[PDB]
Each structure stands twice: as structure tokens, then as C-alpha cells.
Amino acid sequence: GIPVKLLNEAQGHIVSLELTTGATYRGKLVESEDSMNVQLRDVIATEPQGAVTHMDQIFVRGSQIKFIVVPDLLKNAPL
């Protein structure tokens, strides 16, 4: 399916996302999955409060993701 391949193609670029938690994470993406797992670096979190933090490495569960936000050149990619 194409909605997963687009993700794999944004590996390397910087990504923004939203979780069921309520917070948004922003960073370079290293690995993804068909599940929608993620592996990122130099993340800059921002919760409901506005509280910023730093997280060196992160793994996720896709189930917990609401939606992603992806770079603009990834609209000319082949489907």
C-alpha cells in the first residue's frame, strides 16, 4: 500500500507527528515499518502544555500514532 511507502521514502528527512498521547514530536527519521513503528534522533517534543524537551533515541508504536507531517517534495514521488 502507498500510504506506507511514502513514509519509508521520508526516512532521512525531518518529520513531525502527533500521538494519542497529545504531544507532537519533530526529528530526523531513521527507520520505519509496515506497522508504523518509527526510529528518530534529535527529537524536539512539544506537549499540550507547551513543554519542550530533548530525546536522543526513540522507538514508537504505530497504534499510538494519529498522523504524520511530511516534507513537500514527497508529493511528486511515484505512486
Binding site: 502507498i2 506506507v4 511514502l6 513514509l7 494519529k66 507531517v69 513537500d72 508529493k75 505512486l79
Partner: protein, 73 residues
Amino acid sequence: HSSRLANLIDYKLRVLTQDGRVYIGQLMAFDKHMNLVLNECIEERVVEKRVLGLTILRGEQILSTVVEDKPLL
């Protein structure tokens, strides 16, 4: 099936989510889980707006779908 869903492709859509937020933009790619990809997106939390760009939603998060405008040339 999914015959109807291909018909929606490349139309500006109004998508309500479980959070209440509503995303808007064209539809580029579609899934069996209802993962939608949307181009030039704008949330309307409510007298509010934000510019995102390319957004990939999950199936869990989506509630309803509705066409805003016809397919663009």
C-alpha cells in the same frame, strides 16, 4: 471492493477525525485501512487555522469523509 474510494481520488476533501479536528486538501493515496494521504493540508480546530503540508492519517483517527470541490485540472 474499494470502487467508490478510487472515485474520490484527487478531490479536495473535508475529513473529520476522532479528536474533532477537521483536515482539508486533495487526496493522493488511499489504503485498505483507510490511511489517507492529503496534499496542502489545513486543520480547523474549533476562528482557527494552521498550515502543515503533506499529512498521512491513520485509519483509527478518521471518522468521516466529504468532498469540498471537484477534481482539479
